[PDB]
Motif scaffolding. Structure first.
Motif, short mmCIF file in Angstrom:
data_model
loop_
_atom_site.label_atom_id
_atom_site.label_comp_id
_atom_site.label_asym_id
_atom_site.label_seq_id
_atom_site.Cartn_x
_atom_site.Cartn_y
_atom_site.Cartn_z
N UNK A 1 0.78 -1.23 0.00
CA UNK A 1 0.00 0.00 0.00
C UNK A 1 0.82 1.29 0.00
N UNK A 2 2.13 1.17 0.20
CA UNK A 2 2.97 2.35 0.38
C UNK A 2 2.88 3.43 -0.69
N UNK B 1 1.37 8.77 -1.92
CA UNK B 1 0.82 9.72 -2.88
C UNK B 1 -0.30 10.53 -2.25
N UNK B 2 -1.15 9.87 -1.47
CA UNK B 2 -2.28 10.55 -0.85
C UNK B 2 -1.96 11.20 0.48
N UNK C 1 11.99 -1.40 8.88
CA UNK C 1 10.75 -0.71 8.52
C UNK C 1 11.03 0.43 7.56
N UNK C 2 12.13 1.14 7.81
CA UNK C 2 12.55 2.26 6.97
C UNK C 2 12.76 1.87 5.52
N UNK C 3 13.06 0.60 5.26
CA UNK C 3 13.25 0.13 3.90
C UNK C 3 11.93 0.16 3.13
N UNK C 4 10.83 -0.02 3.84
CA UNK C 4 9.53 -0.08 3.19
C UNK C 4 8.81 1.24 3.28
N UNK C 5 8.71 1.76 4.50
CA UNK C 5 7.97 2.98 4.73
C UNK C 5 8.68 3.85 5.76
N UNK C 6 9.45 4.80 5.26
CA UNK C 6 10.23 5.69 6.10
C UNK C 6 9.36 6.44 7.10
#
Ligand code: CAA
Ligand code: CAA
Ligand code: CAA
Ligand code: CAA
Ligand code: FAD
Ligand code: FAD
Ligand code: FAD
Ligand code: FAD
Lengths: 383, 383, 383, 383
Positions: free
Chosen positions: C27-28, C33-34, C79-84
């Motif tokens: 979902x990232x 974007x939103x 976690x930072x690799x996927x969603x900072x």
């Protein structure tokens, strides 16, 4: 806007080139290894005419014939390709000694001291720095007291003076009042051989071995009021303004050292074959060469910009600062990369590449460090 | 995860420190100026015990008593602070000569050649590079033919051999077959004094003047089959693997040179007063010092990482590559900044700062350039 | 010394990796974007036990069972690799909220406030920054007036609060005495929903879109005496010590972003082809990738070293400072480079590489700009 | 040599400055946030005569009256300070469309196509890139089949077209003969609305939001024989020569972005205060600003030099290549730094500094990635 050189500029360029090729190129490695200051090369150099490029024919120069600052600068850059030590020897004479006499000197002082320097008859030096006056050119210990003669007496020392010992005409700064420090420095002309005027130990430097750097010691040196360059207490102004011009010289020196390194690396890359290919066939090498070339060009137009600005009578203080710094940093980057491309051979003092790296380093230091260059530019930027 | 040193590691650290302080520190400036390789310092060094840090007591080492690679490395780093030339002299012996005998040698070869080197009785060298075999270690001209004795004959030259001339035990690589090049190099042990085995001109280097670099020439040199280290045709494997280890040594050398420069700049910043303040009071200076410190720490844990990996029996090929490069680049950055902070004084060979900059440069070149380090890391990365 | 992760460290790492893989990754791109902050995902993260890694079982943490600071740091990196943005919401809670209650709170305040933060039943936030006090922490204007009830009344606001508007428990600093600024700041545990406690501007930021940043408003906020953290006047000490730990987390997030960018670049360079060859076979590409890898390795061991010293109880202020500045500076570099390798596609928000660049810039500014880290380190260096 | 702008150059500069000031500046934050391409503003720009600066009066340009390439370049730089996306829509037209019709088109094709581009009554676009041909221009897959009518039928698509979907006249390259790739590409003037000519994906990009980037689709597009630009097979030559000029424009845009970022940083450093002093009085700040200024000056003179050589008729391929890579590399640096000086506010899309960073990254990739510029320059260097 125009980036084409005049034929006259090209004359002075070709001039130093031929000299650098036939006289400087062969002996440089020997002279640098032994630390030899060859007075005879300097005498040959001085008779070439480069010294009077932008000075009026009135004083024995090419100024009235189409010579200009950029001509003199182009020559400096060219000599720096072959021999950086000699390049700065020339630059100091013109920018730091002849110019201030030419700018702040009376006609008597010009006819007496300027014309020899312009004609290549004498060599000049600039004595401002001393132990407690480095970047802070106001921690000057050197005293200049007035006598009942109306003459002055100097007592002091100067450290790191380029052309020291070898020079004939020295521009020396002394404190005529140590209360208004920055507003109390006075400029004086000293002739080699004045009683009391001696030299100290010769500088043991990292590179630029062909340039002679020496200490000066003033011991009860008495000079006539006639030798005072400009007004009493206006010495700081005179030093700064002449340093603005010299910075273009050092910039041009740095540029030449860089072009030297690029030229070396380019021709080497084609001859050294490893893994079956000449070095230039490996993408990284090509890209290192291309990047070096970009930096060199970037520095270049900045150096020329300043020289043009000066010859036009436009304030060039910041431009010089910018040229000096960008050029010096490029020199250091490009030079360090060059050694790398030569592999182990670059680490040998048999090859020209090591020398260049050693030389690059002073250009970030002398004539005002790169940090003062930041100071001059930022000060302007925040007005 | 743990970043604390063992007491044993601290012993070897303190060991080299005291030596570096009492023996190396005083004479380094003289020795570097004159290019003196002081055999007596080396003999003192070799008797300290550092040489056998990670080797088993079996062969006269501290390995079975808690000594390890990191101990030996810590010492290298420490010596490099005082004298980089001596630092690499030590590093070459252990990592590049003793180790391969210890790793690929038979017990006879160990008892004969390893134990002297471990005990500090002899000095070793590594002869791989030659004119046409630089980074491409397969353009080797050196021939090693077999005789009816079962002995071999070597004919060739080696260029840039660290410890050359001064060393007793040389590990030399020769082509036993020039068809399968990369699969046809063989390693041989050469003793100083073998007939036919001579030395060429001494290297005239830019910095690291305390290290002796010399050419070796092999003229119909006959060695017994007994002197063959490892299998015939397995020489490339042996060179690469021993170079993996040496890279940690050069990394540690680079680190020490950097710490040397930082230490110098820190204490200078507090003593040099300009504009009424010590240098450390100007924000730019402080920030230069802090940044230098960050780079040094970054390199540090990478160097140690590799040493630990090696002592654990974990593949350290890429780690060494990374440590060697990041360390060498830091050394060059930090060292060039240090000279700048010293102003003109940094450009004098009277001060220690110039020397450090000159030394930093080889660490980006020898034992495989930084570009091969890129090759080793990227090759891994793209698998 | 030892660079080996423990079983437990790998468990927490795997733990965060699966959440990233399953819940974050799919979902990232939509959420970023939103610019949405999904409270459900955060509530999911909080339920994994990561929040309690290094706190003791008596508060609901895995500390008594081998969980340590590093385990938590490994999680943040992962976690930072996927969603900072998600990584930092978590880092904020543990490092900037749960940690100061644990480190400074009374057993009562711990049972009440710490337990839910460790267990993951409440989120926390750190409110220090004000429009007139960012880098100058002492510029606090929020006043904490004492009342007859031994109660306090907070008046002021806080700017840029990560997790602001979404947190349950807040740590706010306010000037109890403005005479002794830097010695008169007090910390208070402030709960969301306390009458007078409102929220304001929600920041529209360049990157880290999945993180909610909001202004806090304090209009006559009455707080009970047992909500004071520490004691009158030592709120600056508390904030400072809290920030050293928080910085290790930011260094970790920064590391993670860099790793994501490298992996995207490697994977892409293998697939994309031009001139008939996959991108990874052009030397400039593989070298770029290699340098990136080296840098992230440099940062990695600095991040981990800082985490271990904290868990070991050694002083770590400077290690935190070096880690945070190197990791973020590396992030910004690797990041800007990965976008280049992707070419025209790296500039498209379809691909992940632009987000990584947008995210990387904040790691240089928050929790103490890199310039502060330089101030911290250099000051310790000049002691 | 001469670095003085002419009256006419200053007129076009002032011209663009007022449009920027009045029409661009007030709406830029809205238009950028919403990613809108305002056709009215573009139609306004086109009506200023900038489009005709260096083309002759017989096509409706100011070329016959002293307008030159530099005047147009000064315009692009100026617009780039306000709206980077608008600057490039303009640069694309003049440099990538009007220029090749002028430079390669027949008088007929000039009267028809060039006149409106010069006058500003139609917009133009350059379609070369394909998913399988970005840096490898030769990878063209769009075929241009010849018909009995001496007509052509284009089949294929183009990716990443600036002004795509908003342009009237397109220059498309297609493989007439795929045997001789790099010697078989042909250029065609393709008009919007030609049956079969459709548009596709509109790219969602990281920055330069005010520019429309779209995919072009060619399904059985019939084109008349007199729409061929150049002649069969010399389409690569045309594209290459077109790109050298286009690159000077991109270097200019990049310059402009850097200047905007510097000005924002200076203005802000004067106002914002911390520790009781305006940001500009902390030495690291003023030095940062100084370095930024120096860099932009380095890029500036390279940009202008390239523009002058083109207008003078000298070869400028390499000058274009150096300019584009330096200017964009400087942009990326200055840009990332200005965001730092703004602190937490620089990360907010309220302020302009983040946009400048987002915009700066594209200048390194389009119209030939900086790596191509390195390829171009290094190749010329090794000739
Ligand atoms: C051959 C060689 O190798 C040559 C050698 O290297 S030469 C030795 C090199 N040494 C140096 O370059 C020293 C570097 N330091 C300096 O140039 C200066 O001391 C400095 C830039 C640090 C500024 O010092 P400062 O004391 O802060 O003075 P600053 O504020 O710049 O100016 C002070 C006064 O001088 C004036 N001034 C400064 N620069 C001036 C200039 N270029 N022209 C005229 N006046 C100038 C100022 O206007 C001001 O005047 P008022 O007070 O009357 O208004
Ligand atoms: C004291 C001092 O100052 C010391 C001095 O400097 S020492 C002189 C320094 N000189 C150098 O460092 C030379 C640098 N060059 C090299 O290291 C190598 O030639 C190189 C990295 C460029 C690679 O060369 P290459 O010919 O492409 O070989 P490469 O593909 O790496 O490997 C070839 C073979 O060797 C093997 N190999 C490579 N590295 C190996 C290693 N570390 N261990 C074992 N085998 C290895 C490979 O697996 C392969 O084996 P197979 O063909 O049997 O499968
Ligand atoms: C979720 C998020 O994103 C988190 C957020 O960003 S919150 C963070 C935002 N704000 C910041 O990062 C603030 C940045 N500023 C600072 O860190 C500090 O202001 C500073 C490092 C610049 C120093 O400021 P200063 O006023 O000069 O303080 P300084 O004089 O060094 O120290 C003051 C006192 O506190 C003590 N102190 C400072 N740092 C300390 C530390 N790390 N540990 C313990 N005590 C410390 C000092 O010893 C000193 O004690 P005395 O007064 O008794 O001697
Ligand atoms: C609005 C926008 O944003 C604009 C857009 O980006 S459009 C631009 C997008 N695409 C690009 O920028 C393409 C990047 N790629 C290139 O520039 C090229 O592919 C390249 C520089 C990498 C070279 O590719 P190559 O296939 O190796 O070509 P190369 O062999 O150098 O040259 C081929 C021929 O064209 C000629 N040529 C090349 N460059 C030339 C130039 N600048 N001027 C004239 N002729 C040129 C060569 O001399 C050669 O002629 P011969 O075949 O007769 O010898
Ligand atoms: C080969 C050589 C030739 C020379 N020739 C001449 C010559 O012909 N004539 C002449 O008069 N002098 C000459 N000099 C002296 C030279 O110009 C000075 O060395 C130079 O100006 C620096 O002064 P310093 O060495 O005292 O450095 P310092 O002033 O001690 O400065 C040391 C370091 O601190 C930095 N620094 C100083 N103040 C500040 C500040 N406020 N903020 C931030 N950073 C600061 C400097 O940039 C430098 O990095 C020469 C020097 C050399 C090495
Ligand atoms: C002081 C000193 C001590 C030394 N001591 C020893 C020693 O003890 N033993 C020993 O055997 N050797 C020793 N050497 C040799 C040293 O290891 C080599 O000089 C080094 O490996 C580089 O080889 P080269 O000089 O032939 O460089 P080259 O191989 O000619 O390479 C030159 C340049 O091209 C680069 N390059 C080469 N191939 C490629 C490629 N394919 N792609 C990209 N870039 C490439 C290199 O990185 C370098 O920048 C020493 C050298 C010195 C200066
Ligand atoms: C997304 C985001 C989240 C945040 N979350 C939190 C949070 O949860 N909690 C919290 O309390 N804060 C938070 N902050 C605030 C953040 O830590 C501050 O922005 C930071 O401390 C910088 O302060 P400032 O923005 O006022 O910039 P300034 O302090 O004005 O600094 C601006 C520039 O000047 C430089 N500078 C300042 N002083 C000096 C000096 N003496 N010498 C040299 N350079 C100097 C700075 O390094 C920077 O380059 C957050 C910020 C952001 C953007
Ligand atoms: C907003 C935008 C607008 C554009 N507008 C236009 C337009 O109007 N018209 C038009 O025709 N095109 C346009 N383009 C296309 C643009 O010029 C291409 O993206 C560019 O040429 C790069 O090609 P690519 O994207 O295929 O990346 P690639 O060619 O795949 O390159 C990817 C990476 O690999 C590197 N690389 C590639 N080959 C080599 C090599 N041999 N050696 C080393 N490194 C290499 C590249 O430098 C880059 O780092 C635009 C692109 C964008 C994003």
């Amino acid at each position: 806007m125009d980036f084409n050189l005049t034929d006259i500029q090209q004359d002075f360029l070709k001039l130093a080139h031929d000299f650098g090729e036939k006289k400087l190129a062969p002996t440089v490695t020997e002279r640098d290894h032994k630390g030899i200051y060859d007075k005879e090369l300097i005498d040959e150099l001085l008779s070439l005419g480069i010294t009077g490029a932008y000075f009026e024919e009135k004083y024995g120069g090419s100024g009235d014939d189409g010579g200009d600052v950029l001509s003199y600068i182009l020559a400096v850059e060219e000599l720096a390709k072959y021999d950086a030590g000699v390049a700065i020897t020339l630059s100091a004479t013109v920018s730091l000694c002849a110019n201030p006499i030419w700018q702040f000197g009376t006609e008597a002082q010009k006819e007496k001291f300027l014309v020899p320097l312009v004609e290549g008859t004498k060599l000049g030096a600039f004595g401002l720095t001393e132990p407690n006056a480095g970047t802070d050119a106001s921690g000057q210990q050197t005293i200049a007291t007035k006598n009942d003669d109306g003459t002055y007496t100097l007592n002091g020392s100067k450290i790191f003076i380029t052309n020291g010992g070898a020079a004939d005409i020295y521009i020396v700064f002394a404190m005529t009042d140590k209360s208004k420090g920055n507003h109390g420095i006075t400029a004086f002309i000293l002739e080699d051989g004045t009683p009391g005027f001696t030299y100290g130990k010769k500088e043991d430097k990292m590179g630029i071995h062909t340039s002679q750097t020496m200490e000066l010691v003033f011991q009860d040196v008495k000079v006539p009021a006639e030798n005072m360059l400009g007004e009493e207490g206006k010495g700081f102004k005179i030093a700064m303004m002449t340093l603005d011009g010299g910075r273009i010289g050092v910039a041009a020196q740095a540029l030449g050292i860089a072009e030297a390194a690029l030229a070396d690396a380019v021709e080497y890359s084609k001859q050294r074959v490893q893994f079956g290919k000449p070095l230039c066939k490996f993408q990284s090498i090509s890209f290192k060469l291309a990047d070096m070339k970009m930096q060199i060009e970037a520095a270049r137009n900045l150096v020329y910009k300043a020289a043009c600005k000066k010859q036009e009578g436009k304030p060039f203080t910041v431009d010089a600062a910018i040229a000096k710094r960008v050029a010096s940093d490029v020199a250091m980057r490009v030079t360090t990369e060059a050694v790398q491309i030569f592999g182990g051979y670059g680490y040998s003092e048999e090859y020209p590449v090591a020398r260049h790296m050693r030389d690059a380093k002073i250009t970030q230091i002398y004539e005002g460090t790169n940090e003062v260059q930041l100071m001059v530019t930022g000060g302007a930027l925040l007005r």
